[PDB]
Amino acid sequence: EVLSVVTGEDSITQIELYLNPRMGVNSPDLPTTSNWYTYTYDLQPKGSSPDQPIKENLPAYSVARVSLPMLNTLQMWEAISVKTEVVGISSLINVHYWDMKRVHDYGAGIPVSGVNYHMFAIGGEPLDLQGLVLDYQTQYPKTTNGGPITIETVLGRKMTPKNQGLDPQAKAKLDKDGNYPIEVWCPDPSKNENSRYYGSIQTGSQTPTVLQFSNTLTTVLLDENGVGPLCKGDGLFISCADIVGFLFKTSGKMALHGLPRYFNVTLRKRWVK
Amino acid sequence: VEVLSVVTGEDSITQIELYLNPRMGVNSPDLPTTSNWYTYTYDLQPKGSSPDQPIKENLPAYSVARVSLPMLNTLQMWEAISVKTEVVGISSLINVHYWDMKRVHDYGAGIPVSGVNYHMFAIGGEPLDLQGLVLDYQTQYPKTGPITIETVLGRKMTPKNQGLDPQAKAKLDKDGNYPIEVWCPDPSKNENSRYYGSIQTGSQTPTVLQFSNTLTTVLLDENGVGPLCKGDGLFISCADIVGFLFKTSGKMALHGLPRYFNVTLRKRWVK
Amino acid sequence: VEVLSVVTGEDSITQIELYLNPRMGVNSPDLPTTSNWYTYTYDLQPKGSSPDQPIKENLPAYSVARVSLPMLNTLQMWEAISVKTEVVGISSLINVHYWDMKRVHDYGAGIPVSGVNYHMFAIGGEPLDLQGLVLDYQTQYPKTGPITIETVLGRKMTPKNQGLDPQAKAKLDKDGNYPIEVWCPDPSKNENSRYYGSIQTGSQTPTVLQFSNTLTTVLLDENGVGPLCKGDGLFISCADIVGFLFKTSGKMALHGLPRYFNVTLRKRWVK
Amino acid sequence: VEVLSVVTGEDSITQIELYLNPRMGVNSPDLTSNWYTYTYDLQPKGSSPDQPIKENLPAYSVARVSLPMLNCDTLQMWEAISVKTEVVGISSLINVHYWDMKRVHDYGAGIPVSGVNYHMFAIGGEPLDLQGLVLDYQTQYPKTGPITIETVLGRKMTPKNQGLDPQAKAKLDKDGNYPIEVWCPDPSKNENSRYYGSIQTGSQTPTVLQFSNTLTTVLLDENGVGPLCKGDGLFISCADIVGFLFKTSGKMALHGLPRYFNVTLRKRWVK
Amino acid sequence: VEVLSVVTGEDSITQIELYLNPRMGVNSPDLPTTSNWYTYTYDLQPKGSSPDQPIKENLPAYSVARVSLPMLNCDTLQMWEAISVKTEVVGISSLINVHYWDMKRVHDYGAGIPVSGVNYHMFAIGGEPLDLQGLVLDYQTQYPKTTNGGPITIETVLGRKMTPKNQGLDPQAKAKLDKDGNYPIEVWCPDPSKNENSRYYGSIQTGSQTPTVLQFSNTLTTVLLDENGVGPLCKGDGLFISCADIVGFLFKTSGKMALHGLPRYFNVTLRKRWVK
Ligand SMILES: [Cl-]
Ligand SMILES: [Cl-]
Ligand SMILES: [Cl-]
Ligand SMILES: [Cl-]
Ligand SMILES: [Cl-]
């Protein structure tokens, strides 16, 4: 039960973080494979059943838990507003990647474009996820083999046709950076009372990537009762995903690309019962 | 049905929650060996000769549910005042590696789900009123099966059914049985429902969709009165076609996503 | 005519409902011979030689009705204050399996109704004022029968009719008779009407349309006065071209949808 | 020029109506006049230099309106406070059967007027201040006969006229003489004008335009002051390029539409 | 650093006007042999082999100016506070030209493909240099090493080679936008983790022939006050103005393509503010 806002000196605090994209090649530090950090490997229809995608072809949600100043009818940190920005947008004007497919003979490269997916979330606990897939017959790498967490992971059995729709048993929590595939998991609207999430998709193969950036834009995190996400155990949960389109390679091969996201969250102290 | 004052008291407000799975043509996930295409149509392909005889698996239909509300009884009725609604599984559409997906060019990714979209929802205190109108009146719809204009008139369609025929009316009272291409919301009725919809045409038109748990639709009309649930029944209807799945052969199927609803209702005195 | 106060009394507000079927070129559903193409044009093609001599079936025209209002009679006039309007049958445009539909690629679905859109509606207390302007003044329109610039001028068009010629004026007083490609609302007149319209060109441009029974248009001008119905007549006009039907041969016909109106009117004193 | 109080009295408001026909290159209908409201064929040579013809240089429309004379160090001036403006003849663009139109494909309709759009209007109490900037400084425009950067400089352009050169300035004082591709509004001046404009580039980009007689633009600045009409002259300027006419041969010509204005003015004391 | 009251009395408000010409790669109009390409890049092309070694002329960069403000002046001082700006991309109308002699025709005998494709638009008003964050499409790109202070890239500020982490957010890859036409747009974006004393506003549009859609109007004002009602405060009596306005490609007959940019105009209103 939520009570009055705490009045006093150090009642407001400001938290900063950035999250690097987890597109498939999720580390910049690996000796050899890390050239493709912020990218997938080449995305291709197999041409025969079943699909058996590799983890490098499975862009995943970014998530971080931020520890907040210790507080203790108790006081909890309440997230009230956030400034967030996708970073490195200007990098996408580059149309002279050495192995870029040209728009036509002697032309510039096809710029990063096509499929976009953009979401962020701010919550006082992990984001609630609902599982739904394009094709239930997809064989995702097993979690026990080092793969991501998918619907088969949570069910403890194979997906059935119902997982192409909304199966209420196909649920999870976003508690692991770079391990929950975007194509498997979306925000669960039946839950997430203590989170605020905002997202969009854009399909098409060469659809223009259209993005804005400004340090003047603020998202208010209060619900219709004037209450923001309340941070359980002094943890603020921050999640996102920013697919910005394909890198088109000379051969015809295509890899998805992501960008990092920055957050500045304002929190206040709130009495709870 | 004269509307009196809003009821005051302890248990005067309730919230109703549900989800509706899409009824694209393959409507059940529980079938021997046809359910692999659940949430899809079969292949949509102009025959090249008349007449068109579309199969039921090629007719996306409206989803509908009647939610039973806590029994109440000048009487009290539940009044829907607002709704949070969301299209679920939007993220599933970043998949450009379906095993049998047509590629955008040699060695490239699959053409993503794109093209024709159609998105509507309705919240009402009775079944949504429907108006019949078809692209081609000479279309031979299967008999009962889906309910079409021929079904309701008990005679064949004539050219007037390419426009607005006042006799071509139905009530959306059955899940997965009223084809989208045949029926639309009747704006001449639906006093006790609220509906919101759009269409997008084109073959590879980008599917552009938003999702947020911060967005609320107010269901009150200009007199501050929401839909009043007759017989303690709330009717929820929707359709969400999100584009085509492009197969290697060149064939194409339409695809749909489920929709979630959270409706807030209050008690209302009525005479 | 001087506008006085709004009339007060029990029966001073009234509501008017109607629908207008589209007049695309084949304008009747009742012709045993040709009505299959009702709500469509015939095939649209450049002749390849001069001059263009378009047939009436290829000239979409404005829809119009005069609604008779209750007789009131310094006297009282009906004042249109708001309107709920909706394009009907939007959902029909998801059909991508018309038997003679041009496939998007080999073995694919049909090219959806798409391309050129033109959408307008008007509410007035007298016929809409029309201004004539054409793409090509050398066009030989069928004699009256559609009413064109030649009809009103009593002589051949000249180059000036490719721009604004103040002599090229008409009243929208007949359903299905004034070609959209010749006539547009006249902004220099129409003080007793409200009109709202748009165009979309391109050949395969997505048709993007919305429908809701919650959207109202306010018809009051900046002085709080709506159209006043001369002789107790309410004039409702519209046009809704929704794109091309792409046929297997390559041929293309423009298509239209009907429109619904619910207009609220109040009594007003005038001198 | 010190602005005092608004004049109050019986006859202190006036309305100015006018229309401006487009000046796309063929600027008169009273001759060649078949192509009035169009350019000639726009076509990169493939070799240098470009020496465009005047018929290929769409220009700004302008009119000075003589206002009722009003009149001391302190006198009355007309102040433009608002305007209704509308692009006329938008409906004419539904024509996809110009006799010489390039087809979208074999047997199909003509490619609709579409592609490059440029739309701007301006209301001022003096001529619109113009800034010169060209795509290519090596372009050799015709001598006076349109007014260009060379005309005002009295010498040939240099590379800097591809950017902002502060010497490349002019006033929009003559209808049909200032090329759009050479001149844009000068944001460093124009204190006594309001202007509003947009561009859209591309070859077949949909032309998307709206029209309504219910839309007003307020001309008051941040201090509640509209343009003040020096010597009782109101200056009205525009351009409305609506896309290409696509010809069978592959040749392409730009097309313009006229614009209507209704300007409301009030009397204002000035020192 | 503590903001007190707005100053009152005559002449507390001043206005600053300027324009910034674009720096697309060919940055001067005064070099007789190459200045024909002023406001354009050279031809943009994927090399076909590793590594990319891009030339300066192919690196559109930010425009920046530092405007000197009137002197005003102790613990309590007056500073200029930028409160609003009218800004406009100039020469938008020039883009209707589809008959450039070497313009690629849209189809046989047709008009030229108009300037279109990749747009990038941003402007900033600040009381100090804009803070930059470095991030590149490909970390293996070998940007030019020069001796004349430009182009400045990630390697320049690190004093060592980029690693894979420079395809993401590397907190060490930071700089200040302190020199006109020297900081490449494809390397640097505004740093949202700083810039407390600047306001910035920007967008991108990708695709190759995507319509260039721009507006212009002298009635458009951008308010520069933060949520506390405080605009950028000009330290050293210096107002920093930055922008970039890439408006698309020039499609040449050969198939070759160059990016093009337009200048930007600014009218900034400032007021005197007491500070501690
Ligand atoms: Cl998106
Ligand atoms: Cl839609
Ligand atoms: Cl339209
Ligand atoms: Cl435009
Ligand atoms: Cl942009």
Residue numbers in the entry:
A (entry chain B): 41 to 112, 119 to 319
B (entry chain A), C (entry chain E): 40 to 112, 119 to 189, 193 to 319
D (entry chain D): 40 to 70, 73 to 112, 117 to 189, 193 to 319
E (entry chain C): 40 to 112, 117 to 319
Text lifted from the article:
The human Merkel cell polyomavirus (MCPyV or MCV) was discovered in 2008 and found to be clonally integrated into Merkel cell carcinomas (MCCs), establishing it as the first human oncovirus from the polyomavirus family. Polyomavirus infectious entry is initiated by the major capsid protein VP1, which attaches to cellular receptors to promote internalization and transport of the viral genome into the nucleus for replication. MCPyV VP1 is a symmetric ring-shaped homopentamer with the five VP1 monomers arranged around a central five-fold axis. Each monomer is composed of two antiparallel β-sheets, which together form a β-sandwich with jelly-roll topology.
We solved the crystal structure of unassembled MCPyV VP1 pentamers at 2.1 Å resolution. The crystallized VP1 construct was truncated at the C-terminus to prevent VP1 assembly into capsids, and at the N-terminus to remove potentially disordered residues that inhibit crystallization. However, the construct contained the entire pentameric core of VP1. Similar truncations did not have an effect on the receptor binding properties of other polyomavirus VP1 proteins. With β-strands named alphabetically from the N-terminus, the two sheets consist of strands B, I, D, G, and C, H, E, F, respectively. The β-strands are linked by extensive loops that cover the top and sides of the pentamer. The apical loops, which make up the top surface of the pentamer and thus the outer surface of the virus, are the most variable parts among VP1 sequences from different polyomaviruses, creating unique interaction surfaces. The structure of MCPyV VP1 bound to the oligosaccharides is virtually identical to the unbound state, indicating that the carbohydrates dock into a preformed binding pocket.
